[model samples]
Target: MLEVCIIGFGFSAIPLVRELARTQTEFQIISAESGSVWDRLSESGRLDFSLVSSFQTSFYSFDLVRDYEKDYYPTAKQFYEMHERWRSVYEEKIIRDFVTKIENFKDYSLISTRSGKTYEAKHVVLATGFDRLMNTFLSNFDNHVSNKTFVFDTMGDSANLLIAKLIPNNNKIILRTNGFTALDQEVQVLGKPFTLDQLESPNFRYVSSELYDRLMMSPVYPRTVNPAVSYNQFPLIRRDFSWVDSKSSPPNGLIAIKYWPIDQYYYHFNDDLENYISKGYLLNDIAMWLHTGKVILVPSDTPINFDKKTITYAGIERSFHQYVKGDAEQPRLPTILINGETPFEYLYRDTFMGVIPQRLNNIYFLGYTRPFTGGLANITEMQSLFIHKLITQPQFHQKIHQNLSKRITAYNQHYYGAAKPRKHDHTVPFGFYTEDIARLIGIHYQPNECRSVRDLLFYYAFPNNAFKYRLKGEYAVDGVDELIQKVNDKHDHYAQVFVQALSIRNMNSDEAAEWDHSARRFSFNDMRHKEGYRAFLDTYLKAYRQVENISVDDTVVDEEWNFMVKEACQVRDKVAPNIESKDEDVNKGIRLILSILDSDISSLPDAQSIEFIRRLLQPKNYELLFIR
Candidate 1:
């Protein structure tokens, strides 16, 4: 008999194990194997430590046996190995076996294993992780069954195989998704340069003007209010169009097709596919390609003839394979089909954030929630801490059910933004949810108590990292602050490397410079573009400039002032650029600078612009890019 039995030894288990061990709680951790990552280890090409900070790993210490500070974004191999080392230390508490079924009782639970053994426990934590499966459409197609055809799932282990074998061969690829995939070959099928942004107009719009403007203004610390914009631009494929488009240089015999059944980040059930297509829910980009027998907009219920390598939809047949016979009994081209399926709903609805269900007190869940910007390990740790407190502290546990109910309601409504379709809508916006959980556990950041102004700004303005939690928490450590300092000291270089390695740049120097000049040269025509730049100008006018009675002349300011503030603050990439000096001083400085540049002494929402100046000096203004 055990007090707590943790089923699965992965990211979520580590924090819980540490907490339980600290309290000397009677707990047993079990896994089918050593339990690093079951099948998708290779899926993460190079797992950076934290999604926000490359230097910080799942743990706070920069060094366990070796100094991890030397490298930014260590490989997944390193991440897995660190946990394995932890498992070795906690070897006595771990059981190497799989739990086949868990039967719950009034006070205890019965856990059965495949090896004909059963264990009873008062509570269990199921951090079994999400079930990764091929899309139903791709799995059912007979063509996918053949050895000659390579069907790759970019989201899984097969991605490694595709990157290694199929892409390097220079074969024409039938990319059946609007998303990007890992590949060495140029991504284009016909030599026409195309971007993943082209798939979604909103994403495309971001990439085209705003992304470039921000990158050019300050490429170093590019940030967005919505984390998805930052997240989606990564690993080169989504942003870089040279290889994907024919207008740019592409590899020989490279052909591709991007199919979107639904919008990105939106999921579809087996039933909704037909309904979506019939109701025009899918994007209508291509009327269905006739040249290469490709159907650009494939409906969910489309039928395919695998033997003939053709797809039939809307009473029209299109070939997945193109014709290439040398004038006599031409043979069809050999093509590889790569399907991109957006992440969908999880199987367990109630147990998503580690609370099992309303009735199931003994069973809990972990390591399931994912954030739009940060790593899962941080959230997993937070959930584990909550779970540990629930099992050990009865007084605290009594108050949790009501709080949990409220949290779940808020999560359901706000997490995914609108009409939450999935049970696992746990993807939070970067640092926002981390702060929420930190507050839940009574851990907080005291700006006045921070060591330095730099530390204060980094703590509040920059993205939240796991190290901050370790600074003072149930899992408080000795060397966390020092480790954090080491990372922050070389923050600029490391951040640059991180962005470069991931191919996060939006535009070239020439285009970016021109874009910056154009933004400052705001005109009536600029308002018509409905670009983010327009919003930027609108905010400046409504929030600061208008109140100050600042004049808006259709003329570019001196490039020197633009370069100075932009380069120093790294304004382009920052959603919130930290104010280096005191807020009042910074605002006054900006006002003076703008006044000198525009030749306007500002005037009126009040008797004078000084009150407006005071309002502009607010802490939020110091943080955000837009004047407001």
Candidate 2:
């Protein structure tokens, strides 16, 4: 009898196996594939830097980031190699066989394999992933119109094999995906084109150009850091898609990539339907079903037919056809429906946090939940650690299980209401969710309970990267605190940049240009540069200039400001008790703080300083400096 049995040897299973092996926990790994999926992907020569290396480093003992510099995203090949290395280290344990059935007993579960072998385990972890079925849109089509027509569903070994096999032949590949994985499509619009380079230009709307450039551009070594860039860019990845007119079609020889829009409201389903309907959400989602039911592939100067059952593109270029066609003169392309189904609907219905089920004690579904940002492996590792704790400490399991169950119900209700929920409803924000899991495992710090002010601030402000949880926990990795500090410094740099960018965004062109020249002196790389100085200058200088033009009596406004200052102090005391402020002249100090922190005191509520205090509290500088 094995202590634990893991089905499927994919990326998700790696963490559970690795963690259990590290703790000397008895476990058995079983997969259908003769070669692991990672190996298959590597063999197919389809690999890219989709997953970041740093977030995944904690799962294995070996340093995965040693080869690549800190900023590098690991290629699929790199990850596959790491998985292979891990497998080699824990060799002779994994059984290459298909699990036919899993029978649950009261105490242990019996896992039966296709090789006529049965293994009983105390717990079973379903890391099988979304291999159950391809989406209905692809699976329904049985008859092949042309051999050149291919649907790349299940972006794993099969997809990789097809891509590698077809690439050398220069086959016209039509990619239909929901995400930004396919970048070469170049969907054109009539007016201004969509490019990331625009982020470096002053005309960019959402973020400051300097900050965007710092984030997007990796400065070469010897240059060390881009000192010309004035902001500390956040460690975030964003993809922009350009939309073309309905009449426009794909240019010749280019793959007509059809990106399907993700229905944001599709996942929101719980007990309340009326609430969502009140907020203008549709009851049936008829529009989504109609629009996305069939895949659309349009070619320039060609005829296209779309109906309820099938979507076909006719009279495409025949020279690009690398794959075969059976006695057909004009080849019609098959419309591939990419990511058409909700993969983890079973997990959402059955499990809590998509790991531990409500009633079942012997089965754990690891890495079933998805995140809005950050790597999936990081969350898998977190789940593995929690599982370890659950198995080792039975008392802890009961308590944590109750808490998780309550939270999961609340989370579902809050997000979904009542509709058909999708796989991504299990999705949680990266930072808060990391902290949530950390706290559940007895690793998270409560406000003042943090190790230091800096640590606490980072915990509050920055994206709660997996490294922070590794600093102190049951599965605490060595040298993680050092990693935390490095990441913290990186985040602090970005925070300074964020405030300055916000300040500049609100400024007029002339003032912004003037400030831009002055701001260049205080680069993110400059160690001697005072923290929040640029942000403060941008805030106050702009405020003073604006106020200089207005003829409001300072004496009368000063009195009102004094009252508001007292309120700010009082509210600050109430909101953040841990923070220390000893400014005796409350009136003068509050006026200065509010003015410099970019608060418009002019249009504040006369009777209630409550709204004024709330707005005053919002400024990043005030929170950075005073809020605990």
Candidate 3:
């Protein structure tokens, strides 16, 4: 029987346990666990702990639970109930109260927390959340030490901090830095107006009101903020115009900053970085502006004092200090020692780590990548799939090892954002388990399968829901009405792409080729009418390109290129199928006729696809110019 020891049982650990149990493989699972920390927090009515997406988004992979069982957004308590269900399914394997301190043997292994017992296994899975902030680092009393000191890593910790602060004026809450814990406290203590100041950054924008109203009415990020100013901006519009007419981008300057959809991360929290920056920026802005000196954050220095209270700064620097330990042989060492930054606060830049390490072996790294928006279930599934592939495939494993060896030295040389020397290996953000994992595990990674269709459903099904679409639209506040108007008024490039793609799938040559020469007078008609058609062509072209990127054959790329060229010419020649032979369909004949008429339609370059669509269909210009 294979025996695996897991460190901490948080988000990653639980899902992994559930996954292993369903495998029906002979294995024993042990872990160090307390209870759900969120439950330990004071159950205040104001602060709701709801998972961003519905239960469908958080469902486990096991077959026990029906895929479409119950589609409700669960609260912390409800989610815990679901966990209990998972636990019941895999009871004996889960060991509680058994903490473990990991030790690296020539082979991967682990040691017991109390008795110092050592256990060796073929594979050791580190399901512990590498992102969880360490509570010990909460103490930074070097310069600011006093009678009142409140430190917390999460809600329960914040509750304890509050209890310490509001004891008949015995302790005052003196915050030293900005952390998620602090931000939550601000929202709980302060009322709705999340921010009092007009944002300073020019990059800052807002989602309009009509859209905000739709978002409020939707199931996306359901926070208590104003329902009018949403941030549901689609990269390229999808089937549903979820993020149409919004002005603001995500807050933290998330990876895929402008590209991520609205339902990926705003409420479906994990490590998706695309929407993190823009969403984070807005949330942080609100948290900061509402302070009114109730909270003080010192980013640079640690342990600053004010009014006889010792305050610790829970910034990156403090967190960095906790990660490295001075050693005799190796020097500095990592605490959570894994790739990527903590998901709670990743903003600005693609990655801090230069390259990834190799020693980790066939055992995959979970929760390394971050999404700007998308569901958590898909994230976990992607991770498990990657791991499964890695252990099963030998050739892929060899390739990964060599790749890691090549990159590790360079990564160590320039630590991703370290002030001092870094101890652990680094690499660009690889999501917990997704396409990146598939690549690592020897599975050919496909972009469309990663987060596209599922995301499209999110945007389509939950229009205006910021949390559902990852808070990227104009529905979090009061200006949504205007936002929708703006959407209707402006050209929707994304929508056009999606539509164009769908249209090509159905439209025959005649429909596609038919063009009105009058379209030349109004450039907007070119995009609003053609985006979807172009997108369809693009997806087809990419498929052709893939045959070459993957295969060893020298002619594969050339063949795919030729195919695309042929298709393009076919689409171009659609104008002149004049004789109407029996081979030509009715749609083809019309397209050929339109093509021959010298219509104004122009072939757009790939780079101009999105911008061009956005520029088409100015407000009130509803009719298709090409049909004129």
Candidate 4:
């Protein structure tokens, strides 16, 4: 038996491949894991991690990516090139056949390819995630479906992107959903022509929320006063994207585009599609369709006449000819079902650090989890190191399972503000997870031993990447840190990003409190209605009005700050009528909410004003944006 039989080569397979290759342990399926993303092998279109620093995607060497755009997100062509150069060295082990089945024995596990060639290995790593699970059960003959009035039940990137495309084509589209919007798209550039501010500078970490979440949230970073005012002006001075009105330019998969700016991160699930359309969850799509009278939103549970191309919900027959399976459509498991759902939940949930399975101890699944703000490529690099240790050191697998058990047991209650374990398990905070995995391989970053305070501060301030993890560990190499010299003096950007975080987090405190913390939560969209926007709006305004009554002579600074709060209140009240307004111009009401952030609210509660602006900008800001 070969030491390992790695399945479906993707970014996650890199680490496992490297360990076997270096140790001369004989393995199949080499890691060509650049994006593993060639469903074209080209087109930077889907390279959604979207950052200027080319190296964030680098699993190979820092030197390997030097020739690419140093400050812009690398094009897909450039990214894959680096992988091929690195992937070529391991070409000797390639087996070019499809794996159809697997048979396990006491001594080893065997995988059989479609060509009837069977191979035995002591271990197998299923690095294929994303589509790894049960495909959408629309497997029966639902085709010969319509071309017009199409119905798609997908909650993934492809379907989302696809519907956006279908809308412009003037086709009638019906989407099946429990509700709408998100795993959350991380766009550092808010209003974007994409300028130097959003660039992957050596000094400023190329993240909006992630950068400040570290800076503002951490006590160690020191403090800046009136942070809401001082750094909020930074965007004004550094202008890139023009926020003229709705129908803004396209987001380079989200940079310059500014059409649906309601909160970019607001995720909620609600069945009252009308309330979803009425509240903060505002976008430009529904309005455009309303004018053309095209797209329809239908609940997945109601009833379906697939042959008739009609879905009955709310007692209406919604018609469609075409069918689409969104990212959220299919129940997932390995397409080549390993053991036919025996330990199905264990496949994703009970894995040891998302690499080794509990029941099938030796078969690993690297990069099984995903980073909240980054790519699976970096996660793969970190997991690869963990797998390397297990392969060479049987001793490596011994004590680690205990730590894994302890971690999985502790829910990520603070996960993205609330845990939604029922809907998703793969989302991980990049920094914490990277650090945790690094510790497993003895490669965790050490503060005292590393750079100076500010430089070290700069490292953590940036969105988490695996670059630093490579500095130590068994595979530690040279030539990684030269870029740290760029911008050490700008604690100002630190304040800006930090205050923005404080804004988003503190604003959500009310809704955040609504979250039940008995277990880990992802704050996944829930169809239930609950308290949000009005909770704090009333609280802050109640105090602000008293201050307004007292500020006749204009002696109080915050009282002086009252008018800007007045504008916030005014804009909200302007749209307050909007929640009750005609359906066609609901976009007008939400767009007015978007204007509040632009208004000069110089001295409001640092926390409250941020969410006011933030919720206005999130794509899924409220269940109200959905119209039946």
Candidate 5:
């Protein structure tokens, strides 16, 4: 019997498949020959998946930034290419076939495929993207006018392209969808008609302009929760759908792509009635708003009347040569049996951590849950690690299973924001979900527990990257620091420079050479010439200037300021004790420290006071870089 059988070839299954391959687990992957929705979307050469997200949150190990640009969104073609790359190495392990049936035994489950083969495994994973979940609901949606010449669309890349193509041919499309989408646009970042600074100086390099804008505007440092969406959760999406109509063009891709983001209320479902109309729809193309087409909202129960050549949603009716449709009711999976039911109605609710079901110990459901902010690949990568451990060490299953109830409760809290798992809740509050998963696996850390500058960047910034989860724990790997720098915010480089300059380590002579070098830069004179200093000075100066204007008192803030003064004096005495307060070295050091921190350099402290301030604020192991 095989140890595992994953029945889905989508990106969701890639992590587990990779894990299986690395561990040399006795496993098989039954991939759909045609691939997932993303695959079909790629068929249209003109359109790409509408991802407002950037390469920083890419699927693990695969450096999308290295392959593409610093700022890149994976098109369906790109995803297809990645799929081929994986297939090239693991071809035999994957069988190109469709899963037709599943049978569950106490110890093992059997899966049947279209190729007339049945594979028995100790564990089974239904990785079929949305089939047993949203697709199943959509599959059961009987109100269809398929025989008619009409376009039933959702705001997805596939739908966007289909509509975009039809509009150019002068088709008056009756574009219909549900609810207004949230504006996933980040605030602006540049004004050279919106461009990243092409400065000769490297001091100002930072993350992709899109992410930088978000970092500046977000209320929380690490983005612990999804930004609330009042009117709608899905933003109007745009890949390359730009054209006429006094439309006056949208914002630059860096300033704001598309996709404002989401709120849980949009995903909140009513068991009373399956509101297929109100689920996960993106308003991707602007052409619908142009005079070329008319857009309409159709509720699930509103009913679509189709009579051969005509299709009608509510009272408005229209016809077209092509009927392009997208998934309905939103995003799930199938199984031997999920939590005592033969269906996957509450797959997310029943799964311990969006993988293992409540009762079916041998079967797992991967990639059914949706995240409000983070990507599915990151979460699933963590899911794969958990699956690997449980499969090898059976005790882990029982040990972790003990917290099933509490985990689900936390799940409800984050995703549903309710007392318990509501019937039809959608969208996971990713911050809580990923942290909860990491905590269970013992890879999570408190803010204070972040030991490295890399950790600080991830937890304090980076919008909660999954790279931290991979740094330690059983499956931890090396090359993470290099990986961090790849997608890093150049502003955070100040933190890196500080650590490189301090934090003594290694007594071995070879190691001593490196450590001594970092230790010797007590004055940060070395880093002065490095990149990010200019930006560092600008942000740092502005930061302390708030204190510059404040009233001194018995308050802790004042004490904090005085502490810097005291340290400034101490550092001054150490770096250049003989130099006059207003002279070259003294003025320059203090001026650089205070200037790059860049408030008014005029009242520049003497060199001693400047070195003192540097030591306190940029203390040996306690500095927060503020470049971008």
Candidate 6:
């Protein structure tokens, strides 16, 4: 029987496969299609693999950043190349084909392919990023279209052209996604490496009077790094390719991206001096408030708008048609948006009996549901860990099984035939994924260890690889302290820029708050740059600024901050312990660390579970933590 079967070859799959390979874990790679999405993204100048932090930080347990020759971040293309290079090293295992169905056999699964072939595997790990369904709200395809019309999530080049054709030239092209997707889409059309300066430049103006007043102007340049590479403006490939080889020696003078790099040019651009302002989002909000369209005004009346307050409609088929109907016949507001208040519930239970058969043993249903609040990468990473644990250790299987089993019937009944629901209870009452995972793993997590000085400091300041070899011992308090400090540093810097950004723009720091209470002026589907930025600034601007301001005052109201940071430090120490904790002594190390965390969580009786998690990690826990 085959060892393991992977359904999709995306972010989650790549890492899992790499892990299995590095650990010499037997596995069979069953890919969905002939082409690789990573490469597709790279060809489009969208690098999905270049990590936000350094490769060292992002590297899987068995894979080190040094495994690659370059000390710098790998561009999308380079990441694809690296994956391919690794694949070549393990060419004997991968079986490329599209799986259309899975039939669970006792102790093995018979996977059916579109090509009429079938393969049996002792274990089936669905690494498909949201393999089971499409999260339209978080999907690139969804932002362009509506639920009323039919659109395929897995679109080919032809689909892109078809979608492009649907959009009129003189209309707004707004895309609603999180930072990463939005940034990628911007790179797709605007091109990448939107430089710090480009984003901070001034918009051009035209005047009807004399001299400078009569002149017409435009931005001097678009946002991006100097001399664009693969369009994102970063280097397409590193100068040294030796790291590409698994056997190569670590190179010198290396510079790879860190998970949280501090702002380097702060002194040069003390834009804060006079609040060196940039004409950005705040003005966009005013413009959005001033305009009537639910989406962007693409190629606004600059050269058009000859007569009837005309606005080109730019929506996908479902909402696009809704816009046509809404505009031509009756006056409507925000056509095509499937607001949460809508009346259509998935007839999931009304139509079918969706159940997870016991035969599909230890099957990990990852990325099965989507949420608006998180990104695909983060979500998938969590799912990967879930699968990893369910297979390697049966004890945590209930966490995955119970969590899914609880919702399976209700979800399946409502979503029987309709498009699948993309979101889950990400913002559930208890810190959604974190709480669920911790409970499943049988460990209560917390911010502070409640231990004395040396323990706390040692926990946080412990060498990066120190815990890798521990047996069973409580985590040191010092290590927890250090971890919290790191996240605090990141949060603090973001605050500094945020306050300056608000003052310079003369906009309220709580922009998203307004949208939180009221209906959004534009929308997630609509690619209104100004409105979206407003959303970003609103959510992060004020809150983080307070964090920075609070850092300065020892006597300030920052107890909560300190607590959360401590929690995060504890989690960081737990996840990335410096030593291997598998051998007899190492297992002891694992128990000890978990014990400390368990105690820490017990101490923080008043904190929100999410806050408990926030103390442990930031909003992107799903992204950073190697949970399944």
C-alpha lDDT of all candidate models, in order: 0.39, 0.40, 0.30, 0.41, 0.42, 0.30
Q: Tell me the deviation in Å of residue 4 in model 4.
A: 3.2
Stretches of candidate 5 off by over 4 Å are 38-52, 62-69, 131-163, 170-178, 185-187, 190-346, 417-426, 451-457, 491-628
TM-score of each: 0.52, 0.51, 0.41, 0.55, 0.55, 0.40
The TM-score of predicted model 2 comes to 0.51
Across residues 1-628, which tens digit of lDDT does each residue of candidate 2 receive?
A: 6788877766666766767878788888887756544454455533421232233332432252233224333445556776777667656787888886666666776667789897888877877655323222222222222223333212322233233233222122332223222111111111212111111211111123333323222211111222222111100111222321111111001111111111222223223433432222221211111122111212222322322222133322222222211111111111111122211224463455557765555677776665443356656767777677776677976676656666666544433434354433455434434555666777765443334323323433344555556666576777665655564444332233223333344445444433433322221122122233334323322343242232223222323323322432342234323311111222233333334333233333441333433332233321110011
Candidate 3 per-residue C-alpha lDDT over 1-628 given as tens digits, one digit per residue, 9 for 90 to 100: 2445544444544555544554543445555554444433323321123343334345443321323333334454556566566566666766565543444444454444554554555455544433333222222112122223243222222233232222212222322222221112111001111110000111001112222222222212222121111111111111122322222222121121111111111333334322322122111221211111222222223543344433343321111111111111121112321222221122112221111224332234444433333334545555554444344445744554555534433332322322233222221212211323333433322222223322231222122211121122211223433433333223221232223222233333333323211122111111122222333322322332342232222222323323322432332234223211111232243343223222222221242222322222121222111111
Residue-by-residue lDDT tens digits, candidate 5, 253-294: 111213311111122112211221122222233321221122
- Candidate 4 ranges beyond 4 A from true positions: 23-25, 30-68, 71-87, 103-107, 129-147, 183-304, 311-318, 325-346, 402-423, 446-456, 483-495, 498-628
lDDT of 1: 0.39
- TM-score for candidate 1: 0.52
Candidate 4 lowest-lDDT run of ten: 248-257
The positional error of residue 414 in candidate 4, measured at the CA in angstroms, is 8.8
Candidate number with the higher lDDT (3 or 4): 4
Alpha-carbon shift of residue 365 in model 3 (angstroms): 4.5
Model 1, 1-628: lDDT tens digits are 6899888776567777878888999998877763433224434332211111133424433242136444333334555666667667877776788776666666777777777787888878877665433212212222122112222212212222221222112222232322332211111212222222111111111123343233322211222222112112221123222322111012111222223211120222223433332222222111111111111212233445568876443334434433211111111111111111122122333332434355455666676555433246656767777788878987766665645556555444333323424322344433444555565566656443434323323443334555556676665767776755665454321222112111223446444333322332111111112232333323322332222233334253433323322332222235322211112232243343333322221221341433432232232211211101
Which residue runs of candidate 3 sit more than 4 Å off their true CA positions?
Answer: 1-10, 14-24, 33-48, 51-73, 96-118, 130-307, 310-357, 360-379, 407-433, 441-628
Clash count for candidate 1 is 19
Model 2 C-alpha lDDT versus the unseen true structure: 0.40
User: Which structure among the candidates has the greatest lDDT?
Assistant: 5
